[PDB]
C-alpha cells in the first residue's frame, strides 16, 4: 500500500512521545496544512504529493519557531518545503548552462545528478542537505521513495520506501530508547550498544547500506 | 496546459487524411477505449496515465488489422501505433530488462539531461513501435533537464534518447502538419516520409525526428 497507515500511526507515537520526554519540541509542532493550502503548493510546483506525504502535512505543518525534532533536523513547513523546491530548481537550470561525481546507493535506484525539480524537501540540515521525496526514480528505484540529497550528499541513499516508513522508522528509535537530551536538544545514541552520540545522517547512511547488503543475495 | 486539446484537433486531422488518402490505413485505427480499460491498464501497471495519452485511447485503441498476412501498415510513416494491450505487455517485458540488468554501450540524452541515461526505465511507457525493439513513448521520470510525460525513443537501437514533443499532442499534432504539408510518399501503398518543399529524399521517420530534436537543441 501506499504508506498513510505508517504516517498516521507514526505521528501519534511522536506526538505522545515529545509531550512526555520534551514539551519544548512537542510546542513546535504547527497546526495542520487545509487542503487548499496543499492545494495551491502542488500548483505552484506542478505536482502531486504522494498520499502519505498529504497525510502528514494534515497533522503538522512543519515546525515554527525552531530546533529540530529529527534528532535535530527540522521538519519543513510547506512554505519551506515550496520556497527550497523552488532554490534546488533554479540549481537545476544553472546546472543545464554550465553542462565530484555523484552516486545512489542502492545503485540506480536515485538518479546521479546533483539536483532534481522532482525531489521534493520535506526535512532540512540547516546546512544545505534534506530528507525528502523522489518523484523520478531511477531504475531500480520506486516512486515516491524517501531520499537524502544535498550539499553533501554527491552519493544519495533511499534510506525508505514511502513517507510513512520512514517517520515510523523514527518513531520506533524513540520508543526504542535510541535518545539522548542536551528540556534541551535530542539526539541519537544505539542504546542496546550503550554507544556514542551519532549524527542522524550517518546512521541512515549506515542502516542504508546494511539493508542493500543484507539484501543483495536474493534474487529468484 | 496539458496537450489534451492538441491530441483532439491532431486526431481529428489524422482521422480526415487517411480516409481521403489511404482508406486501408483509416481501416485499421482501432474502436476506441473506455474508462475501464485504461483504468485496469493503469491498476495493472501502477501508473498514471498523462491526460493527452488518455484522450488518444479514447479515440483509438492502437492499429489492428487481422487480415493482411504482410502485417499491419504503420500510420506513423511505418510505425505501429500500440493497442492498449500490447502497451501493457511491452511495458511489463521492459521492466524485466530493467530488472535484468541491475548490476548496453554509453547512453546519452538530447537535449543533455533531458532523459535519464539508462537502457530502460520502468516509467518509459511505449506508445509506438517498430517491432525491432525500439519505440516512442511517453516518459515519466525525466531527467533533471527534462519535463515529466514528454515523448521520447528508445530501445535496442537507441543508445542515444531524444526528446521529440514536449507532451503526446504536441507529438501527434506535428505528424498531422507533415501530413498537410505534403510530406509523404505511397509505396493502397505503404506510408513513407520525404520532405516535398526541398524535394527531399525517402528517410526513415526516426532519423527525421532525430534530425529535428538536435536541431531544435542547438538554437
Known amino acids: 500500500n501506499d504508506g498513510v497507515s505508517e504516517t498516521l500511526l507514526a505521528w501519534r507515537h511522536i506526538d505522545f512521545w515529545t509531550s512526555e520526554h520534551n514539551p519544548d519540541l512537542n510546542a513546535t ?23 502519505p506525504v498529504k497525510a502528514s502535512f494534515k497533522i503538522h505543518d512543519g515546525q515554527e519557531d525552531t ?17 527550497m523546491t523552488q532554490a534546488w530548481r533554479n540549481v537545476a537550470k544553472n546546472l543545464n548552462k554550465r553542462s565530484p561525481d555523484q552516486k545512489s546507493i542502492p545503485p540506480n535506484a536515485v538518479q546521479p545528478v546533483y539536483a532534481h525539480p522532482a525531489w521534493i524537501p520535506l526535512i532540512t540540515d540547516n546546512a544545505g542537505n534534506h530528507i525528502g521525496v523522489d518523484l523520478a526514480p531511477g531504475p531500480n528505484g520506486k516512486y515516491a ?37 542536551v528540556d534541551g536538544e535530542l539526539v541519537f545514541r544505539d542504546k542496546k550498544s550503550n554507544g556514542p552520540i551519532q549524527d542522524y545522517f ?13 539484501e543483495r543475495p536474493h534474487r529468484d
Request: some cysteine; charged content about 20%.
Open 29 to 51: 509542532l504547527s497546526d495542520p496544512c487545509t487542503q487548499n493550502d496543499i492545494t495551491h503548493a502542488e500548483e505552484d510546483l506542478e505536482v502531486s504529493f504522494p498520499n
Open 67 to 83: 530546533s529540530g525534532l529529527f534528532y535535530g533536523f527540522q521538519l519543513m513547513t510547506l512554505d519551506q518545503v515550496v520556497a
Open 145 to 181: 521513495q524517501i531520499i537524502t540529497f544535498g550539499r553533501d550528499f554527491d552519493t544519495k541513499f533511499v534510506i525508505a520506501e514511502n513517507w510513512g516508513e520512514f517517520l515510523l522508522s523514527f518513531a520506533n528509535d524513540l520508543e526504542a530508547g535510541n535518545w539522548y537530551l
Open 202 to 214: 550517518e546512521v541512515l547512511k549506515r542502516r542504508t547500506w546494511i539493508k542493500y547488503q543484507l
